[PDB]
Amino acid sequence: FLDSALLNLMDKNVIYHNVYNKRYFKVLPLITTCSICGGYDSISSCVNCGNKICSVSCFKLHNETRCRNR
Amino acid sequence: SLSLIAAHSHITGLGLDENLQPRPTSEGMVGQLQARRAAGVILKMVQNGTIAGRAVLVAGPPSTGKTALAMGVSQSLGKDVPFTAIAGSEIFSLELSKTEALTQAFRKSIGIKIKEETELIEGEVVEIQIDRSIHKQGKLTIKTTDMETIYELGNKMIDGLTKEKVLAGDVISIDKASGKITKLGRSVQCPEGELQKRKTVVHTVSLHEIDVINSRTQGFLALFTGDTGEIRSEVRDQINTKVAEWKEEGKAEIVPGVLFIDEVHMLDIECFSFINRALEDEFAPIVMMATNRGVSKTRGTNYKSPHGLPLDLLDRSIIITTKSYNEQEIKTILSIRAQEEEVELSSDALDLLTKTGVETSLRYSSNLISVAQQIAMKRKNNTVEVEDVKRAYLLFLDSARSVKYVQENESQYIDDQGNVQISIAK
Numbered sequence: 001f002l003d004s005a006l007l008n009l010m011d012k013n014v015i016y017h018n019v020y021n022k023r024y025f026k027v028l029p030l031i032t033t034c035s036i037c038g039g040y041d042s043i044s045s046c047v048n049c050g051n052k053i054c055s056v057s058c059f060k061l062h063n064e065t066r067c068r069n070r
Numbered sequence: 071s072l073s074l075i076a077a078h079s080h081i082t083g084l085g086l087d088e089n090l091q092p093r094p095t096s097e098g099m100v101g102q103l104q105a106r107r108a109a110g111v112i113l114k115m116v117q118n119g120t121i122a123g124r125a126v127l128v129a130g131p132p133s134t135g136k137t138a139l140a141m142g143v144s145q146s147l148g149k150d151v152p153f154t155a156i157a158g159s160e161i162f163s164l165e166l167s168k169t170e171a172l173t174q175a176f177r178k179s180i181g182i183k184i185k186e187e188t189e190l191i192e193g194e195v196v197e198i199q200i201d202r203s204i205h206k207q208g209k210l211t212i213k214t215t216d217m218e219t220i221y222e223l224g225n226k227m228i229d230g231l232t233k234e235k236v237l238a239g240d241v242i243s244i245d246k247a248s249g250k251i252t253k254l255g256r257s258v259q260c261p262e263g264e265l266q267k268r269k270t271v272v273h274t275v276s277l278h279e280i281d282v283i284n285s286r287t288q289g290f291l292a293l294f295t296g297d298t299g300e301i302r303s304e305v306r307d308q309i310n311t312k313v314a315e316w317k318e319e320g321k322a323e324i325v326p327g328v329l330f331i332d333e334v335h336m337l338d339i340e341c342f343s344f345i346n347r348a349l350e351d352e353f354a355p356i357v358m359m360a361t362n363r364g365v366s367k368t369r370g371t372n373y374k375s376p377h378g379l380p381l382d383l384l385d386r387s388i389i390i391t392t393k394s395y396n397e398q399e400i401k402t403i404l405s406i407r408a409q410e411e412e413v414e415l416s417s418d419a420l421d422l423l424t425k426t427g428v429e430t431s432l433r434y435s436s437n438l439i440s441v442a443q444q445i446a447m448k449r450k451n452n453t454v455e456v457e458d459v460k461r462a463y464l465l466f467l468d469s470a471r472s473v474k475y476v477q478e479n480e481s482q483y484i485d486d487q488g489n490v491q492i493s494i495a496k
């Protein structure tokens with residue numbers, strides 16, 4: 001149906017692109033949390049891939065299973 | 071705290087058991103059983119903290135242990151509790167009124183403990199990368215025993231690190247809230263765990279310290295310079311009401327302490343009149359007063375008094391009386407002093423010292439130990455024998471012998487009328 005030529009260009013535009021936000025992209029604050037447990041009290045970026053962790057246990061967990069670039 | 075040997079170094083406590091009954095010889099104290107029992111009662115009152123504005127008078131003949139008793143009370147009371155010891159002659163100042171000096175002394179003996187919870191990151195630095203405006207982009211890496219992560223800095227943290235000029239490979243401490251940086255040497259020592267730790271730091275201050283801190287723009291220097299000045303009473307009232315509010319909130323606790331005036335027989339009638347009322351109010355510490363004179367004229371007054379103190383103050387105080395020692399107690403006190411001074415006395419030497427102390431004075435025999443040790447060392451002898459003590463006795467005179475010599479030769483000294491016969495002839 002989407003690929004069908006019967007759906008006109010402006011119809012597709014209004015049905016999919018127009019309904020999405022176009023002006024206000026982020027009005028709330030940006031909150032960064034631990035990639036492993038979502039904590040926020042302490043935050044630091046892993047040396048290898050630049051993703052955030054919060055504690056020694058989360059450090060070990062990320063290194064053992066989550067680290068992508070290594 | 072390195073220091074030389076004093077005259078009260080051996081007294082490491084009050085020497086009581088669980089039932090407050092003092093042992094014959096413990097913690098460096100000998101004898102004075104009832105005095106030590108009463109001092110233990112006072113110490114328990116101080117530790118309880120529920121009783122305020124009590125004055126205890128430590129009266130008795132000289133060389134009986136009043137200052138020793140106070141020192142034992144202070145040591146058994148330990149640290150983490152204020153203990154202000156001022157001589158009665160320290161009140162008279164050219165910058166502070168006597169009432170103001172007494173007030174400052176009273177406030178110095180009431181402590182306030184304030185707990186501050188700080189978030190500080192401690193670890194071994196590895197790399198620091200700071201770049202120019204593209205305001206500032208910066209990354210620091212802190213290694214510990216089990217973590218190694220990078221931190222994305224901000225403007226003020228970058229400015230602080232540049233100001234400190236932290237190198238690499240050195241243990242560093244950074245506070246998240248305050249922003250203070252404490253440097254440490256290269257990791258003897260090493261980081262011990264998580265990067266960001268939660269440890270509380272407790273600050274012990276007195277009411278006087280808070281008063282002086284709020285007295286001026288930078289009043290906390292006056293706690294060392296001593297130019298506090300007479301603080302306004304409204305400031306003290308503010309401190310008092312805020313301490314009450316903090317205690318109610320539970321964010322600060324009060325540790326009542328002991329104020330010791332060693333020579334109360336020097337304070338004037340105005341000081342005693344002030345003390346009478348200062349004891350009544352809350353936040354009043356426990357005042358210990360040491361006096362020796364039996365009946366004397368109170369300074370500033372023309373009449374005698376039961377201890378040199380006005381009757382109004384004596385009504386408000388409980389009196390602990392100390393009694394003169396006997397031969398055996400003198401012997402064991404001298405043994406303790408000799409052990410403290412690292413002097414190995416012989417049995418006969420100790421007996422001679424004990425008999426000399428009983429005949430003349432305990433302090434005189436206590437002072438002769440070091441002189442006897444030096445005399446023996448001139449003979450290349452280790453132990454101090456009888457003849458060394460005899461030579462010390464011959465070379466150094468006590469009060470009675472000096473008085474006898476002055477009386478028998480009153481012409482060659484200057485008398486009260488200002489007369490002397492310098493000429494050896496006629």
Ligand SMILES: Nc1ncnc2c1ncn2[C@@H]1O[C@H](COP(=O)(O)OP(=O)(O)O)[C@@H](O)[C@H]1O
Binds near residue numbers: 077079100132
């Ligand atoms: N009960 C005691 N136990 C141990 N040492 C004592 C005792 N009483 C007095 N002394 C010693 O005697 C010396 C003088 O005592 P001091 O404190 O001056 O008494 P006072 O102040 O009444 O003259 C001190 O160096 C102290 O070590």
Ligand SMILES: [Mg+2]
Binds near residue numbers: 136137332360
């Ligand atoms: Mg004394």
Ligand SMILES: [Zn+2]
Binds near residue numbers: 035039055
């Ligand atoms: Zn986590």
Ligand SMILES: [Zn+2]
Binds near residue numbers: 047049050051062
């Ligand atoms: Zn990673």
